[PDB]
């Protein structure tokens, strides 16, 4: 069930309440979710950790 989900979902997978409040009012969605605590995103710094 995780494998048949698109990669954008796997990006935002932890941040559902921020995601759906930022969709149900027209705001900017999160970019990290549960995947923020990966070591590579730890190595990145700035807006390129969103990248």
């Amino acid at each position: 069930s995780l494998a048949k989900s698109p990669a954008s979902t796997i990006q935002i997978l932890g941040a559902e309440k921020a995601l759906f409040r930022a969709l149900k009012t027209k705001h900017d969605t999160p970019k990290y979710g549960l995947l923020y605590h990966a070591s590579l995103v730890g190595q990145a710094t700035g807006k390129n950790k969103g990248k």
């Binding site: 494998a3 048949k4 989900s5 698109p6 990669a7 954008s8």
Partner: protein
């Protein structure tokens, strides 16, 4: 690759990639596997084209598993390079979903190709 069920022959793959080219000109396709699965989730895909050419084919063969839940037709063509040429980008494209429309100019061509697809299921 053995585990790429229905694979098209040359004539069917030529008309599949022809309707892919005119859907790309009409901005009616979503190119890429994640965009194809998004259209599968939202139920706005007419049929899915995949490429039996990716070196892990298991990055593909999961959208069959939710094609057979929404009974949307899906087909394999032998070349990801040629699918990317048909979709009209500079990269190889692994999967492509032709999206739904009811005022579309190429609706008859889409319907003819999807009937030829669901004959071989």
């Amino acid at each position: 690759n053995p585990k790429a069920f229905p694979l098209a022959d040359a004539a069917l793959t030529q008309q599949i990639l022809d309707v892919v080219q005119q859907a790309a000109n009409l901005r009616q396709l979503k190119k890429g596997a994640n965009e194809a699965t998004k259209t599968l989730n939202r139920g706005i895909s007419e049929f899915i084209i995949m490429a039996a050419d990716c070196e892990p084919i298991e990055i593909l063969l999961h959208l069959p598993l939710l094609c057979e839940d929404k009974n949307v037709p899906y087909v394999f063509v032998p070349s990801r390079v040629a699918l990317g040429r048909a979709c009209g980008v500079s990269r190889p494209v692994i999967a492509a979903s032709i999206t739904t429309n009811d005022a579309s100019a190429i609706k008859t061509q889409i319907y003819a190709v999807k009937d030829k697809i669901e004959t071989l299921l």
